[PDB]
Every structure is written in C-alpha cells, then in structure tokens.
C-alpha cells in the first residue's frame, strides 16, 4: 500500500506573482485529443492542472468515495435485517 | 466534487508531423523503474503515454467501475430481499 | 477497460546517477499550493516524487481496494441470507 498521504498539486486558486493570472486554466481541447509534439512546449498553466485534476481526482475516490460506499454498504444491510426481522417477530 | 469532467490526456492515437510516430508510446522499463535525472529532457511519446495511463484509469474508475458496483450491491440486496419475501410468503 | 497494465514511475528508490540525492522527493507545501510558475525550472526530483504517487496509488485502488470490497459484499450477504434461512427454518 502506499505509505504516505496524497497531496494536491497547486491546490490553491490564486494569480500567480509572474503571470497575474489564475495558477490553472484548462488546456486546449485539441491538445488533449493529441498532446505535445516535438517543437510544441509545454505551459505553465496547462501542466500544473493536469497534475492538479489528477490528485484532486485521486482525493476524491480515496478519501472520499470508499468510506461513504462502505456507510452505505452497512447501512443497506442494517434496514434489510430490520425489515425482514419486524415481520418474523409478526 | 471536482468541478471539471475528467478529460483524457491524448485520448486520441495518431501520427504527429513533428516525429512521424504515434503520439504515445511505452517508456522503456528501465526509465519506469528508474526515472529522470537532471539534463535529461522527456520525449514527447513518454509523456503522453504517462499522462494518457494516469487520466484514462482515473476515468475508468470513476466513470465505469462506481457506476456498476452501486448498481451490483442495490441488485444484490433487492434479491436477497425478494427471496426472504418468497420464503415469507408462505 | 483501459487497455494499459498501469505501471508506478519510478518505483525503484536510488540516489540519481549524476546526483547523489534521491530520485524522489516531497515537494515543499509551498509549490504544492501554488505550482509552477513563469520562469521556474523543474527538478527531476518533484516530477517523479509525484508521479510515483500517482501510479502508487491509481494501482492499489485498482487491483486491491476494490477485490477486497467485493469479497466483503459477498460475504456480507452470504452471512445475511444465512440468518434468516435459519431462523425461518426454525
């Protein structure tokens, strides 16, 4: 299993001091229908969002999505067991 | 939660007039085992392929996987119920 | 299903060849909430501290996290179903 804590990468939704502009944008959809080529170049902003939607991502089906799927699992049985169990004591 | 729908780096496969070549390819295990160094600058088909494996398998999981385990799971206590509903019914 | 069998970035952990630090490293929080910026130059170090991280991570939901919710489903509702047929039965 991994053995530290998933960090976010520019998790904050700030101008940049360099560029004034929000540190994430999104890129061009025709780049990612096909991505860089040999005398493209990468841009700030693009790269850090990738990495950003990627960790933000993992968070959510780490942190988030499994603990409230195992509540539900419980939870599902929990109702089951006390329907069934009303009509036995009937 | 996060506010963008999953986007997949270089979803699309292609020949990029820049190399010639198709826009993704396997690194080299050695590489995956190890790594970059300072002075080494990434090819363009390494990258792409390392984005493309982390964005498509965040999709599949979240798009693909979920989807069908919550339907699995509210399927599989429907029945049990129904059964337990047969064997009451009697 | 994607097609790739999702590998980890440099899941070997040795000094760099030309440096005798670690190939791998935490980014500080500060460029972690923030990101690149204008004119700033990457390290090796940080690109595959966090891609590690990322394929560590993508793999184990993938191949453990989600088998072992399974078998606790399916032995959940074995139990489950059990009860009840007994206290039927009786």
Not at 9 to 30: C, E, F, H, Q, Y
């Amino acid at each position: 299993k991994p053995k530290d804590p998933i960090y976010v990468w520019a998790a904050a939704d700030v101008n940049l001091p360099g560029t004034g502009r929000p540190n994430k944008s999104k890129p061009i959809d025709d780049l990612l229908a096909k991505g860089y080529d040999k005398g493209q170049k990468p841009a700030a902003e693009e790269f850090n969002y990738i990495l950003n939607m990627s960790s933000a991502w993992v968070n959510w089906i780490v942190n988030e999505k499994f603990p409230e799927l195992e509540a539900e699992i419980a939870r599902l049985l929990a109702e089951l067991e006390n329907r069934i169990n009303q009509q036995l004591a009937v």
